[PDB]
Design a protein around this ligand. Structure first.
Ligand SMILES: Cc1cc(C(=O)Nc2ccccc2F)no1
Ligand code: NA
Length: 188
């Protein structure tokens, strides 16, 4: 077959009911995740190949970066709660991996304030139980798919993308194969 179970994707032994149709896990400490976001724009190209309005979800993980990694999961919950993902993703990746200026929770906050989120608004969100529930949702989703590495993408809670075997000599062709594979999986 052109798309083979065990090759370009793997079938979860324990499917996840009610899972988002497209579910991505990442860490701001994760180098391939930085590439997937700012160099390849995987999510945006996957979105362009899927039907209008399909549910795409992106969650942060705790298992990289120790204490600051877990602060970033909570900051990503703030980003989701406020709808400012597109304003903070690049500066958070740069702060962790490029400049290494993000060393504390206060440095994470600085990124949000520089991006235009008012300090009072950030602090109210950070301390809110809406954000605690989003943190719990991110942890539970990772536990559901039994997650040990990022970046990772899961489709309809049933299939995991496997990019390892794909030709990466041309970034545009790779991104196209990735997105067409997500499309194929979503149509199964
Ligand atoms: C924010 C943010 C998201 C990512 C990321 O890795 N996206 C991604 C792309 C394709 C497949 C799985 C993925 F998790 N990095 O930063
Ligand atoms: Na194509």
């Amino acid at each position: 077959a052109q798309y083979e179970d065990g090759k370009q994707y793997t079938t979860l032994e324990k499917p996840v009911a009610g899972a988002p149709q497209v579910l991505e896990f990442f860490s701001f400490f994760c180098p391939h995740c930085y590439q997937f976001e700012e160099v390849l724009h995987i999510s945006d190209n996957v979105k362009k190949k899927l039907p209008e309005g399909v549910k795409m979800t992106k969650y942060h993980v705790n298992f990289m970066g120790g204490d600051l990694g877990k602060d970033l999961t909570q900051a990503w919950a703030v980003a989701m709660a406020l709808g400012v993902e597109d304003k903070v993703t690049v500066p958070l990746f740069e702060g962790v991996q490029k400049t290494q200026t993000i060393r504390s929770a206060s440095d994470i906050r600085d990124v949000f304030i520089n991006a235009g989120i008012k300090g009072e608004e950030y602090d109210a969100a950070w301390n809110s139980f809406v954000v605690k529930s989003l943190v719990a949702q991110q942890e539970k989703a990772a536990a559901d798919v039994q997650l040990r590495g990022v970046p990772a993408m899961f489709v309809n809670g049933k299939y995991q993308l496997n990019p390892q075997g794909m030709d990466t000599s041309n970034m545009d062709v790779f991104v196209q194969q990735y997105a067409d594979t997500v499309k194929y999986l979503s149509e199964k």
